Design a protein around this ligand. Structure first.
Ligand SMILES: NC(=O)c1ccc[n+]([C@@H]2O[C@H](COP(=O)([O-])OP(=O)(O)OC[C@H]3O[C@@H](n4cnc5c(N)ncnc54)[C@H](OP(=O)(O)O)[C@@H]3O)[C@@H](O)[C@H]2O)c1
Ligand SMILES: Nc1nc(=O)c2nc(CNc3ccc(C(=O)N[C@@H](CCC(=O)O)C(=O)O)cc3)cnc2[nH]1
Length: 159
């Protein structure tokens, strides 16, 4: 079982040149609880963004180039990424855009945070046709003193 997890603003924006213009510590907590003790596959740019291995997770990094950090596992293909996760109940694909695009057709679950933020970015979560996906969980949150925007956690499972 392969799952994708992603935080989407408007227009499914997930990434931009600079740090996202928001502070969403609840979404970070959601990402951690949904990824903890699972293998995480990410692309090299997301690996760079994160800065260090996600603790408590087997970290698998996709790059066409040789790896540059022996703390994590580097693979050169989608299939090698999956294989490098081993035999687990659930692989979490944590982005970014090129990685999500390649893993979405493989995935059985999506964990999406829909953030009510108007941002320009160069990177978008893929179109998922909702005839393919059933929303099994939905939880909306207003912005508050810790969270700059309203956001909604959703889990979809593939039909
Ligand atoms: N014109 C564009 O918009 C464009 C096009 C490409 C990239 N970018 C820039 O990259 C940033 C974020 O991109 P992202 O979120 O898409 O990054 P991402 O998915 O986190 O990382 C992408 C990197 O992962 C590796 N990768 C992904 N799939 C692979 C595969 N099947 N086999 C081998 N390696 C694989 C490649 O690493 P290596 O590079 O080490 O091979 C690729 O460059 C953006 O700020 C964006 O501007 C932009
Ligand atoms: N829902 C969701 N929110 C996200 O921010 C998110 N981010 C990514 C990719 N980028 C990142 C960047 C940093 C960390 C990160 O450092 N998380 C730490 C908590 C430490 C912190 O507070 O920064 C973790 O342990 O998961 C994770 C993913 C992928 N899916 C997402 N999914």
């Amino acid at each position: 079982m392969i799952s994708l997890i992603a935080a989407l603003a408007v227009d499914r924006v997930i990434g931009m040149e600079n740090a996202m213009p928001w502070n969403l510590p609840a979404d970070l907590a959601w990402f951690k609880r949904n990824t903890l003790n699972k293998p995480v596959i990410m692309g090299r740019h997301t690996w760079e963004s994160i800065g260090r291995p996600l603790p408590g997770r087997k970290n698998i990094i996709l790059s066409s180039q040789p790896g540059t950090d022996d703390r994590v596992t580097w693979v050169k293909s989608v299939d090698e990424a999956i294989a490098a996760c081993g035999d687990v109940p659930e692989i979490m694909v944590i982005g970014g855009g090129r990685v999500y695009e390649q893993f979405l057709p493989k995935a059985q679950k999506l964990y999406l945070t829909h953030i009510d933020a108007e941002v320009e970015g160069d990177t978008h979560f893929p179109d998922y046709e909702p005839d393919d996906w059933e929303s099994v969980f939905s939880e909306f949150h207003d912005a508050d003193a810790q969270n700059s925007h309203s956001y909604c956690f959703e889990i979809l499972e593939r039909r």
